[PDB]
């Protein structure tokens, strides 16, 4: 089979620069007939892929002309001239030459914009899940950029570990930021034994630490 | 307008054949290539094998050979792909997909909107939904469903902007967990209310989130 290798897998850039993709294949992509049989493909999240390039150079329709595509034989380059914040996501390269298909691996575009901190939130559990013995405490980090964001929770003020799961949106199409949910799970038993429950979170858009924190009961 | 239009996801016990379907339109059906790609959870994209339904010619990834079965029925201008026997390893998204002219293979253009399939031993569990009570925020905790997906959207889609629905966490007790959150201006606190349908196990729920 045909080895497709894209590079980098992860590009960062910012909206109105220039941006491109290399995709390296391990045989020659050109037909006998004179083209080559390199796809490009942009993939959003939540989305299937969707044709940007085929046969090398030709601009698919429908696709904005800051999309181009050149190469031939086995080095092929992906290139926006100026990127916007909609173009979030993953593309892959696909060679038709010969059976089976093969892809690239992906590269995974990330737009690059200011820091931004997050508004944060934090929910005790709802009186319908008490019932039935467990509480969940969730705690909000939202619209916040770049990615890295640390949260401690602490019932108590003591430091909590393990009994916590984290998610994360993938780049807002729009403003490019993320946002992220954390989710402190404890018995009805052992919520009940306690009084403040606290989401301490570090952001690099933050001067200091911020705590957003309930007492159980109290509202 | 061309249309690749899929079957609906699917929960299959091992062991157990399956067939998929991808249903076309606003083309000509029969000279046309019809492939079918995986793509596993965060993971790439593999070429499955492929029919030109004309005269079900077809061609296969080695790798998927006699694993699978590609065909179609023209009369409803649709494909199939369908598997003998099941494996754990088979849970997978699954996409068909057809290249940008007639004729002779020359890659892909067209994606359907992907059939997602899971192969598991354990029953379907409905999410119970719980409110998150509030710029303000609120939203709705979708906990404790098998399998994947949920789809939740706000005020039966009238509300859309400030929403972000979070990834599935799969939690330690094998059940998935999402929440779903919105900002809104502090000042209306209007009526919200999050839709949640959990097809595999007919879970359909409209609660409404009030401080
Ligand atoms: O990011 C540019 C983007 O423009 C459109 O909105 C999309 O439909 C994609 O097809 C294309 O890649």
């Known amino acids: 089979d045909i080895v497709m290798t894209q590079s980098p897998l992860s590009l960062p850039v910012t909206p109105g620069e220039p941006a491109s993709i290399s995709c390296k294949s391990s045989?020659?992509?050109?037909?006998?007939?004179?083209?080559?049989?390199l796809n490009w493909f942009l993939q959003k999240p939540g989305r299937s892929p969707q044709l940007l390039i085929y046969?090398?150079?030709s601009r698919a329709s429908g696709v904005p002309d800051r999309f181009s595509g050149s190469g031939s034989g086995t080095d092929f380059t992906l290139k926006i001239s100026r990127v916007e914040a909609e173009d979030v996501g993953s593309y892959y390269c696909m060679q038709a030459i010969h059976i089976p298909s093969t892809f690239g691996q992906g590269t995974k575009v990330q737009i690059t914009r200011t820091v931004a901190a997050p508004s944060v939130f934090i929910f005790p559990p709802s009186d319908e899940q008490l019932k039935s013995g467990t509480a969940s405490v969730v705690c909000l980090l939202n619209n916040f950029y770049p990615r890295e964001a640390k949260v401690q929770w602490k019932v108590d003020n003591a430091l909590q570990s393990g009994n916590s799961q984290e998610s994360v949106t993938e780049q807002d199409s729009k403003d490019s930021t993320y946002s992220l949910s954390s989710t402190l799970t404890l018995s009805k038993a052992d919520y009940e034994k306690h009084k403040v429950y606290a989401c301490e979170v570090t952001h690099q858009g933050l001067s200091s630490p911020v705590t957003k924190s309930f007492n159980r009961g109290e509202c | 307008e061309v249309q690749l239009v899929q079957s609906g996801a699917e929960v299959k016990k091992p062991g157990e054949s399956l067939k998929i379907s991808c249903k076309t339109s606003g083309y000509s059906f029969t000279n046309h290539w019809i492939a079918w790609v995986r793509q596993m959870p965060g993971a790439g994209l593999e070429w499955m094998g492929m029919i030109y339904p004309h005269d079900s010619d077809t061609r296969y990834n080695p790798s998927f050979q006699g694993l699978v079965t590609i065909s179609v029925d023209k009369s409803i201008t649709t494909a199939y792909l369908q598997w003998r026997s099941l494996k754990a390893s088979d849970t997978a998204m699954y996409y068909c997909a057809r290249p940008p002219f007639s004729g002779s293979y020359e890659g892909l253009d067209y994606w359907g909107q992907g059939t997602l399939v899971t192969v598991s031993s354990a029953s379907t569990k409905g999410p119970s939904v719980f409110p998150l009570a509030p710029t303000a925020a609120l939203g709705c905790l979708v906990k404790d469903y098998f399998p994947e997906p949920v789809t939740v959207s706000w005020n039966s889609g009238a509300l859309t902007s400030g929403v972000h629905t979070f990834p599935a966490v799969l939690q330690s007790s094998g059940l998935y967990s999402l929440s779903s959150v919105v900002t809104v201006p502090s000042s209306s606190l209007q009526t919200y209310i999050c839709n949640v349908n959990h097809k595999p196990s007919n879970t359909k729920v409209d609660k409404k989130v009030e401080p």
């Open positions: 046969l090398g150079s």
């Open positions: 045989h020659s992509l050109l037909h006998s007939n004179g083209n080559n049989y």
